[PDB]
Symmetry: C5
Subunit: 203 residues, 5 copies
């Protein structure tokens, strides 16, 4: 149902980011904060459910469906390169809540939306006040610098991090994101990250 | 015991939904709500034990058995494509409680019945009243739109979710399911989901 | 030090229950309840440590040792078909506590003894009284109906479920087992199961 | 660096205990109790950190290095057979806290030292008194009987189980062991075990 | 996009530490203490988030990129030998929080930075006084002695373990790291270890 032999090159190359020429791969990231599921005021720790909507394009993947009546194909994440996103301020390993699959379209654009439960520390002293408590989540490639992996995000038009939030216990008061590019001790080059700031209080 | 060389095609193709023609694959789901194992009123979270009874048919699979004594065969889930059903409102990774195997019939129809412990948020303010609290569970394919993967109510109808329910702690008042479809941001086509709605109260 | 090439066939057929002709495979199950390690009266949930002693025979396995001074050989579970036993009433995935290995004898009989911590719902309202609380553990193949997989067990001799029980916190008052056979609403045929009934109380 | 094609035989045979003749492999086990990290008096459960020092010899492994400048080689456990030690009285799966690797010397000697966190039941009624609480840990092969796998242990004067013990919460009062050989029911031959007995009290 | 065939040799050799000559491999380590996420004074147990910055050089790896546009390449850890660093005094298995990948440079140096949550025991008697409680973490190779694996200390600073520290619950008062060498039972050769010592208190 697909060009199966191509898929063997694709998985064969999966250890390495798929670059064309020298150009950085643009990886588009958008976030949806879905729910806050722990707000532990004694430990000062929060758990959220977050959907990371990631997409990138590898033109040579377009041959996968060229001869197929499929418009797109869903494939296990293990079959190709996917971004090594890490939460820089996670204090427990994020827990995947969705199927570990990506969708490839006819033009080679790839879409990947892990839904994860993520824990981090946050000062919850004001969580039961009208302004609420303000928390941040930082996400970026752990190992691909910005010469190879460049973060892009939605337009000031389309960004709506709180769009689908729903909780019977907490009110989500605001949610914004910055796109950052920083030098660290390890490496020649800089790393891109997006950081979400949000505020919430108890209902 | 079976046509082993066919299994090599079946496993070989297991990354991709098995379609023929354009036609979406029909996947029927029925559910058994077995137990409500937590209802935490301070966090507004509920954990249930749920069997998902999923079936679909792949004509070419029928040759697996046609010349063997066996009327059906049970195989590990890793040997073929299986639906990537996710609980859209899950707040923890569902925990599999039963052996991960499917059963293939002589005509190539397949049955898969995972038992899973699933956690999600619910407003429990009324859990201790006669009408009780109403909770919803949303299930659908994470990455196959309804051009490829169509959900249908299975043979048992919408009416037998509570058949095996047993708890010393909770009364299950009612349970039904409804089939819906939604437009998502990522994609042009809609996704099918089945939504389970149940009411329960403390004993 | 065994007939390795025969292991190629054994492992090659490990997806499928090893039948000779049409006859169902006799799988014998005996149990030892070792301990009760949680009895939560607020949640009504018990955790036990249980050994399931399972044995079956596959005559063609006898060639594995025919050439060797080994009387029996221990092998990884993954190298052959083993029974897909499940706890029908588990509310958490069972935790294996022992080496995942089976032993094949020179006559091709196979012994598999998993030790597992298993959690289930039990009404514990009477756990701190003289008669104690009565709990049940249901065990059977998840996907092999009784036309393929026949459960058998010890007579009134060899059956002593409480033989090794030790707990500083609970008295095991009595444990019994009973073979049963049920048809399920999802499914055509009947499945064998053994139900273990036990009573315990606080020391 | 090493005779790589030898390792192909070593890994190839890794499913099965490496005997020569029909002599049991001698497996030497010594223990170091490092710490007691849980003593829950409400549940009468203890957790310890324990180093198990295992070693055995497989003369044919000597060719792995005989032409190498390496005096010994550290390898992943998955590359060769290792003893299937179980804690016969564990109530949770022991958690590995150290790298899963063995060291093979020039003579074919193998050393494997896992550090594990292990939970057991123990009557803690006297933990806060002078006699302390006395606990036992029993360890042996789960599936290799003493016709194949024979335990040996420290030349009874260099058995010092308490040697590196260190805790700010508990005094280890004593720790000894014995080497036992017992008959089991599935089992026509006997199984070796070492039982550690220790007494501790709250500081 | 790289020299794939060379990667076959690198992975083929991944079981074994990469030495040239009889020279010890220099493995450089620096640490960043990110957070203290638990200090349980009842149990005298501490959890921290720590980045371990490791680097080492393997000259023959330089041919991986020789003919490529990439100045460096990120690869999954499973593709090459990486150090078997263990927390000698961990009381629970360290939890990895970051993507499991390394970066290989044009000259064959390798960078690996695991973020981990690590638990250990610490006398917390003084955690709530001005000088605070002093804790220690010991890191080194579990199975590579210092004739094969030599520890050298990080490239930027030695008291700046705290560069990224942030906690709403605790003040970090001091942090230092120090190289040591310790002799063990198993081995006629010594193992290097780095000991982080830090003092912290409740805010």
């Amino acid at each position: 149902q697909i060009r199966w032999t191509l898929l063997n090159q694709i998985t064969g190359e999966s250890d390495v980011i798929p670059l064309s020429n020298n150009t950085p791969l643009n990886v588009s990231l958008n976030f949806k904060l879905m729910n806050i599921v722990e707000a532990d005021t004694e430990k000062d720790q929060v758990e959220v459910v977050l959907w990371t909507q990631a997409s990138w394009k590898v033109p040579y993947y377009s041959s996968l469906l060229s001869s197929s009546s499929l418009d797109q194909v869903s494939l296990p994440v293990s079959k190709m390169w996917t971004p090594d996103l890490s939460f820089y301020n996670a204090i427990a390993a994020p827990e995947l809540l969705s199927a570990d699959r990506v969708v490839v379209s006819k033009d080679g654009s790839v879409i990947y939306v892990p839904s994860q439960r993520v824990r981090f520390t946050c000062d919850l002293i004001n969580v039961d006040t009208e302004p609420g408590a303000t928390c941040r989540i930082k996400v970026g490639s752990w190992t691909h610098d910005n010469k190879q992996f460049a973060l892009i995000t939605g337009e000031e038009g389309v960004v709506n991090i709180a769009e689908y939030f729903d909780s019977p216990k907490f009110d989500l008061l605001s949610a914004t994101q910055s796109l950052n590019r920083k030098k660290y001790s390890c490496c020649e080059n800089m790393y891109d990250d997006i950081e979400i700031t949000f505020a919430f209080r108890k209902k």
